[PDB]
Design an enzyme around this catalytic site. Structure first.
Site, PDB file in Angstrom:
ATOM      1  N   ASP A 280      -7.307 -10.518  -0.863  1.00 29.14           N
ATOM      2  CA  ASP A 280      -7.711 -10.363  -2.284  1.00 29.14           C
ATOM      3  C   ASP A 280      -6.989 -11.368  -3.192  1.00 29.14           C
ATOM      4  OD1 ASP A 280      -5.395  -8.903  -1.459  1.00 29.14           O
ATOM      5  OD2 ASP A 280      -5.419  -7.725  -3.292  1.00 29.14           O
ATOM      6  N   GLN A 281      -5.973 -12.039  -2.676  1.00 30.18           N
ATOM      7  CA  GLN A 281      -5.124 -12.915  -3.525  1.00 30.18           C
ATOM      8  C   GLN A 281      -5.932 -13.953  -4.330  1.00 30.18           C
ATOM      9  OE1 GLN A 281      -2.338 -14.051  -0.553  1.00 30.18           O
ATOM     10  NE2 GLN A 281      -2.066 -11.901  -0.014  1.00 30.18           N
TER      11      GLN A 281
ATOM     12  N   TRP B 137      -1.289  -7.782  -5.256  1.00 28.82           N
ATOM     13  CA  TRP B 137      -1.596  -6.971  -6.439  1.00 28.82           C
ATOM     14  C   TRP B 137      -0.362  -6.311  -7.036  1.00 28.82           C
ATOM     15  CZ3 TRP B 137      -5.428  -7.169  -9.632  1.00 28.82           C
ATOM     16  CH2 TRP B 137      -5.682  -6.125 -10.537  1.00 28.82           C
ATOM     17  N   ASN B 138       0.532  -5.756  -6.215  1.00 29.88           N
ATOM     18  CA  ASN B 138       1.710  -5.138  -6.818  1.00 29.88           C
ATOM     19  C   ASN B 138       2.569  -6.165  -7.547  1.00 29.88           C
ATOM     20  OD1 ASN B 138       1.437  -2.311  -5.734  1.00 29.88           O
ATOM     21  ND2 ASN B 138       1.430  -3.511  -3.842  1.00 29.88           N
ATOM     22  N   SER B 139       2.649  -7.382  -7.008  1.00 25.81           N
ATOM     23  CA  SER B 139       3.438  -8.433  -7.641  1.00 25.81           C
ATOM     24  C   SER B 139       2.826  -8.844  -8.973  1.00 25.81           C
ATOM     25  CB  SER B 139       3.512  -9.638  -6.694  1.00 25.81           C
ATOM     26  OG  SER B 139       4.406  -9.384  -5.614  1.00 25.81           O
TER      27      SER B 139
ATOM     28  N   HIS C  10       0.842  -1.212   0.000  1.00 20.72           N
ATOM     29  CA  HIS C  10       0.000   0.000   0.000  1.00 20.72           C
ATOM     30  C   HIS C  10       0.871   1.254   0.000  1.00 20.72           C
ATOM     31  CE1 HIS C  10      -3.887  -2.150   1.092  1.00 20.72           C
ATOM     32  NE2 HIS C  10      -2.967  -3.101   1.164  1.00 20.72           N
TER      33      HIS C  10
ATOM     34  N   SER D 222       5.170  -9.317   1.332  1.00 21.25           N
ATOM     35  CA  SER D 222       5.750  -8.657   2.491  1.00 21.25           C
ATOM     36  C   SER D 222       5.049  -8.979   3.807  1.00 21.25           C
ATOM     37  CB  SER D 222       5.770  -7.137   2.261  1.00 21.25           C
ATOM     38  OG  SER D 222       4.448  -6.616   2.305  1.00 21.25           O
TER      39      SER D 222
ATOM     40  N   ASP E 119      -6.399   5.483   2.270  1.00 20.06           N
ATOM     41  CA  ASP E 119      -6.487   4.071   1.908  1.00 20.06           C
ATOM     42  C   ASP E 119      -7.776   3.467   2.462  1.00 20.06           C
ATOM     43  OD1 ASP E 119      -5.668   1.657   0.725  1.00 20.06           O
ATOM     44  OD2 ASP E 119      -3.713   1.659   1.739  1.00 20.06           O
TER      45      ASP E 119
ATOM     46  N   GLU F  97       3.570  -6.014 -11.439  1.00 18.18           N
ATOM     47  CA  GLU F  97       4.991  -6.062 -11.840  1.00 18.18           C
ATOM     48  C   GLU F  97       5.196  -7.179 -12.871  1.00 18.18           C
ATOM     49  OE1 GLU F  97       6.317  -4.475  -7.457  1.00 18.18           O
ATOM     50  OE2 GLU F  97       6.891  -6.490  -8.040  1.00 18.18           O
TER      51      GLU F  97
ATOM     52  N   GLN G  10      12.981  -8.079  -6.155  1.00 16.26           N
ATOM     53  CA  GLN G  10      11.955  -8.745  -6.955  1.00 16.26           C
ATOM     54  C   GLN G  10      11.891  -8.180  -8.366  1.00 16.26           C
ATOM     55  OE1 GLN G  10       8.238  -9.959  -5.273  1.00 16.26           O
ATOM     56  NE2 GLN G  10       6.971  -8.986  -6.855  1.00 16.26           N
TER      57      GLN G  10
HETATM   58  O1  LIG Z   1      11.362 -10.207  -1.281  1.00 12.70           O
HETATM   59  C1  LIG Z   1      10.553  -9.354  -1.675  1.00 12.70           C
HETATM   60  C2  LIG Z   1       9.136  -9.402  -1.495  1.00 12.70           C
HETATM   61  C3  LIG Z   1       8.341  -8.409  -1.969  1.00 12.70           C
HETATM   62  N1  LIG Z   1       8.886  -7.332  -2.650  1.00 12.70           N
HETATM   63  C4  LIG Z   1       8.022  -6.255  -3.151  1.00 12.70           C
HETATM   64  O2  LIG Z   1       7.008  -6.024  -2.187  1.00 12.70           O
HETATM   65  C5  LIG Z   1       5.766  -5.709  -2.876  1.00 12.70           C
HETATM   66  C6  LIG Z   1       4.735  -6.710  -2.453  1.00 12.70           C
HETATM   67  O3  LIG Z   1       3.484  -6.112  -2.665  1.00 12.70           O
HETATM   68  P1  LIG Z   1       2.231  -7.088  -3.066  1.00 12.70           P
HETATM   69  O4  LIG Z   1       1.030  -6.228  -3.359  1.00 12.70           O
HETATM   70  O5  LIG Z   1       2.599  -7.982  -4.220  1.00 12.70           O
HETATM   71  O6  LIG Z   1       1.915  -8.096  -1.820  1.00 12.70           O
HETATM   72  P2  LIG Z   1       1.803  -7.813  -0.207  1.00 12.70           P
HETATM   73  O7  LIG Z   1       3.184  -7.620   0.364  1.00 12.70           O
HETATM   74  O8  LIG Z   1       0.964  -6.575  -0.002  1.00 12.70           O
HETATM   75  O9  LIG Z   1       1.119  -9.005   0.407  1.00 12.70           O
HETATM   76  C7  LIG Z   1       6.024  -5.824  -4.380  1.00 12.70           C
HETATM   77  O10 LIG Z   1       6.306  -4.523  -4.922  1.00 12.70           O
HETATM   78  C8  LIG Z   1       7.261  -6.672  -4.461  1.00 12.70           C
HETATM   79  O11 LIG Z   1       8.050  -6.280  -5.578  1.00 12.70           O
HETATM   80  C9  LIG Z   1      10.243  -7.231  -2.862  1.00 12.70           C
HETATM   81  O12 LIG Z   1      10.745  -6.281  -3.450  1.00 12.70           O
HETATM   82  N2  LIG Z   1      11.014  -8.250  -2.362  1.00 12.70           N
END
Ligand SMILES: O=c1ccn([C@@H]2O[C@H](COP(=O)(O)OP(=O)(O)O)[C@@H](O)[C@H]2O)c(=O)[nH]1
EC number: 2.4.1.-
Length: 435
Positions: A352-353, A331-333, A14, A250, A113, A336, A313
């Site tokens: 949401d996964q 969602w960010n993954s 977020h 994360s 948010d 990406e 990542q």
């Molecule tokens: O070892 C790791 C794990 C996660 N990420 C980054 O952390 C974010 C994870 O956000 P996401 O929405 O995918 O999942 P969340 O952490 O919210 O469950 C993404 O930008 C990943 O690129 C990273 O850089 N390295």
């Protein structure tokens, strides 16, 4: 100069999305106050180039603190899952401090948010317009909302079906859902959403109908950076599109049984793999060898690499040896992976996964490893999909669709933010008349 205070939820994903949006607004002549806990501001500051120092200011938000829940735990990032209720509760208790911040800074606009119903309430009390920025996609929200109103009508457009595992989990739960939907429903004039029409357009339009609110896409907000050296040396020795990156984000820590299924699925697939293994911030029995099946890394030998803690990542997804992404479908993954053209092998875990994995499957840019009737990850399903997508390459359609999506996303530019900026301008001009 128009001033915006942004209040992300305390999760790294977020915060990352909010920061990318802040950078876009800074380029459009807005001044941004970026407000979060100090531990989160520490984590996100390295992502902010020096050129934004004049237009983006970091502002500390204080949560209630105790030696049992001290400020370095005021984030979801590596938080023991058993502390997540305390974190949500502590966040709600920052409303008084948040009000004092809004009084001292008097921003023209709040962007908040979806996990803080107190935030638009504080803003309304101070006559500050406030807009919800939802950092995840629309598919899950609409898939969840539709059956409450229309339990006997098929969800339109999609063939997705939520597995019974998550139906039981989302069946306290009502209070969390009402609070989340309140943040969207209370938003002034529009909801900003971190998605794009080529992926979710018809679902954006339907959610706008279900909520009776206008929905404005702010596009894929993907951070691109300009540890890895050791990893790149290993990857450079691999064949092109031969390696999967394995990550669960994360704020999730797969159980020992879940890790066993993933590990045996990687082994049986014979793929090359880089796997990030993390332990919660207070776990003293932290062992990669203990966490993984006995002999796993020695049997994998040259094919496997485990990274402890955090991995680069984005850089790994961009490497030419990477042919797939075994992802929890945060969602960010997902955004990406699409931006970099990498097929997703979905292993969703919670929140949401499962919906995100369904959208990935429907868009054709990935596949989902299905769980057993009891909700368990299956090593055989993991191995099979890695084999088809990456090793033997009998699912080239998934790679082709991911590459086409990548070219669509790479074509987008600053116009992605035009609709947001016009709607902010209109809201502020209308609110100034009403006083
Ligand atoms: O070892 C790791 C794990 C996660 N990420 C980054 O952390 C974010 C994870 O956000 P996401 O929405 O995918 O999942 P969340 O952490 O919210 O469950 C993404 O930008 C990943 O690129 C990273 O850089 N390295």
């Amino acid at each position: 100069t128009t001033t915006i205070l942004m209040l992300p939820w305390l999760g790294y994903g977020h915060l990352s999305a909010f920061l990318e949006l802040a950078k876009s607004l800074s380029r459009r002549n807005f001044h941004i106050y970026f407000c979060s806990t100090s531990v989160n501001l520490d984590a996100i500051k390295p992502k902010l180039p020096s050129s934004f120092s004049d237009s983006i200011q970091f502002v500390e938000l204080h949560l209630p603190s105790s030696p049992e829940f001290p400020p370095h735990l005021h984030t979801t990032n590596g938080l023991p899952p058993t502390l997540m209720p305390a974190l949500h509760q502590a966040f709600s208790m920052a409303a008084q401090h948040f009000e004092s911040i809004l009084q001292t800074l008097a921003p023209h606009l709040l962007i908040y948010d979806s996990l803080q119903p107190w935030a638009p309430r504080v803003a309304s009390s101070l006559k500050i317009p406030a807009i919800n920025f939802n950092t995840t996609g629309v598919f899950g929200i609409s898939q969840g909302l539709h059956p409450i109103h229309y339990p006997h009508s098929k969800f339109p457009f999609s063939e997705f079906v939520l597995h019974n595992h998550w139906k039981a989990m989302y069946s306290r739960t009502r209070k969390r859902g009402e609070a989340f939907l309140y943040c969207l429903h209370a938003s002034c004039s529009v909801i900003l959403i971190n998605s794009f029409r080529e992926l979710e357009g018809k679902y954006m339009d339907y959610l706008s109908v279900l909520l009776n609110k206008k929905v404005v896409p702010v596009g894929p907000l993907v951070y691109e950076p300009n540890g890895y050296s050791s990893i790149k040396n290993w990857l450079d020795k691999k064949e092109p599109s031969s390696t999967v990156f394995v990550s669960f984000g994360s704020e999730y820590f797969p159980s020992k049984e879940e890790m066993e299924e993933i590990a045996h699925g990687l082994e049986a697939s014979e793929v090359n793999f880089i796997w990030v293994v993390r332990f919660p911030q207070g776990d003293n029995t932290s062992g990669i060898e203990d966490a993984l099946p006995k002999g796993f890394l020695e049997r994998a030998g040259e094919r496997g690499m485990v990274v402890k803690g955090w991995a680069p990542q984005a850089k790994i997804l961009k490497h030419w040896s990477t042919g797939g992404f075994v992802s929890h479908c945060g969602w960010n993954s997902v955004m990406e992976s699409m931006m970099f053209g990498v097929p997703i092998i979905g292993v969703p875990m919670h929140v949401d996964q499962p919906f995100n994995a369904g959208l990935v499957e429907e868009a054709g840019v990935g596949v989902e490893a299905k769980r057993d009737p009891d909700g368990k990850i299956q090593r055989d399903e993991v191995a099979k999909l890695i084999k088809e997508v990456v090793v033997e390459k009998t699912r080239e359609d998934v790679r082709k669709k991911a590459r086409e999506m990548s070219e669509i996303l790479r074509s987008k530019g600053e116009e992605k933010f035009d609709e947001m900026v016009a709607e902010i301008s209109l809201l502020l001009k209308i609110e100034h008349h009403h006083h």
